[PDB]
C-alpha cells in the first residue's frame, strides 16, 4: 500500500535536456526551453510529483500530475501512456498501481532519474522521436537500458 507524503512542483527534462509538457488533448511532448520559459508556460510544463510512502520499498513511489482546468494523472494501464482526469489519491491499496511510478537514480549516472511503472516490472518511461517531435512512452528496459529512460527532475516550489 501507498500513502501520500507530499507533493512538489517540478520540471521533468529528458536526455536531450528538453522539457516535458502536456497540451489540450493530454498530448505529452518534449521541447527545448529555459527554466524561465517552463515557469512562463506553466501549468503545461510544471508537474506535480506526489511522493508516497510504500509498505514495500522499490524505492521512491511517485505519481506525476498536471493541472489544466482540472488535474490529470499520468497512467501506464495496459502498457499505454495516458493522462486520466483525476487527483493523486492520499492512499492507494495494492503494491502495484497504474499511476504509481518508482523513481530511482540511474546507477553510475550522477543525478539522472528513471521511472519504473509499478504495474509493469521492467517497463520504464522513456522518450522517443516521432520523426521530428520527441514523445513520452512506456518501454521494457531491463535488457536494453536505453539512455532515453534518463530524466532530470528540477524543483519549481
Amino acid at each position: 500500500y501507498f500513502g501520500k507524503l507530499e507533493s512538489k512542483l517540478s520540471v521533468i527534462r529528458n536526455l536531450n535536456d528538453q522539457v516535458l509538457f502536456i497540451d489540450q488533448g493530454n498530448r505529452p511532448l518534449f521541447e527545448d526551453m529555459t527554466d524561465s520559459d517552463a515557469r512562463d508556460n506553466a501549468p503545461r510544463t510544471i508537474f506535480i510529483i506526489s511522493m508516497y510512502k510504500d509498505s514495500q520499498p522499490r524505492g521512491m513511489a511517485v505519481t506525476i500530475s498536471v493541472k489544466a482546468e482540472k488535474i490529470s494523472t499520468l497512467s501506464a494501464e495496459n502498457k499505454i501512456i495516458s493522462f486520466k482526469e483525476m487527483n493523486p489519491p492520499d492512499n492507494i491499496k495494492d503494491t502495484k498501481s497504474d499511476i504509481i511510478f518508482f523513481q530511482r537514480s540511474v546507477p553510475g549516472h550522477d543525478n539522472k532519474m528513471q521511472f519504473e511503472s509499478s504495474s509493469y516490472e521492467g517497463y520504464f518511461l522513456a522518450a522517443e522521436k516521432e520523426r521530428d517531435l520527441f514523445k513520452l512512452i512506456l518501454k521494457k528496459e531491463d535488457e536494453l537500458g536505453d539512455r532515453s529512460i534518463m530524466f532530470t527532475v528540477q524543483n519549481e516550489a
Partner: antibody
Amino acid sequence: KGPEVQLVQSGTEVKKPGESLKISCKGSGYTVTSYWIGWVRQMPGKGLEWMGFIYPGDSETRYSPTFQGQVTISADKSFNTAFLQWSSLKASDTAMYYCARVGSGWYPYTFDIWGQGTMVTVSS
Amino acid sequence: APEIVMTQSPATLSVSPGERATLSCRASESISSNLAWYQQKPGQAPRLFIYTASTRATDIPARFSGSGSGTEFTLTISSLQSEDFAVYYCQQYNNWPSITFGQGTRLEIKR
C-alpha cells in the same frame, strides 16, 4: 520509404477454401516492440470489425470474443512484424484486413497509424 | 462483458458543398468521453480525426468538430469541402481492449 511512422502489410492473397494463410504487417519509424497492434476486418461494402491485439515486445494477445479461436495473432519481435493467420480458410473470410497501431502517449487507445490493407479472396 | 453497441445515424447523408453536416453516434451504455471518429475514403484505410470525443487529431481542419459525453455523440463538419465527403466511423474505447465501432455514415454530395 522512411523514416516516417508506418505499417506495411503483405500483398493481395487469392486462396482456395481449406487452405491455411498467414498475412504480415511490418512496422517502421518507431519502437514497434512497444505499441499494441490491432487487426481489423472489413468485409466488402461493410464496416470495421476489431479482430484482436498483439503487444509485439512480448507477444501478449487480446482476441475479440467473435474472433477468439478462429484466427491466430502473433509477432516476430526482432523483425518488427505482426501476423494474422487462418488454419483453414472459408469463402466468408473474403475481406480487406487492416493492421493498425494503438496510440500511446499521443491519441492513447485509438488507432493512430494504419497499414494500407491486405485484400484476401477465398474461392474455389 | 457484453460488447457496447455503437449506433450511427443517418446511414447516408446528402449535404451540399459549403454547408454543414451533423453526424450522430449513440452508445448502448455510458462511455464517458472514450470515443474516436475516423474518416474512410474509397480504397483507403480509415484515418483518425477525433479522439476523446472532442479533440482533433494530426492536421485535422478546424471545420471538423466533435462533441458529446456519456451516451450521445456528434461530429459536425462546417463549410464542407470536396475532400470531406467519405464514410465516418465512431469507435468506443471505454474499457480497452474491449473496443467496438459503429456501422458508419456515408456523407455524399448533394447536387
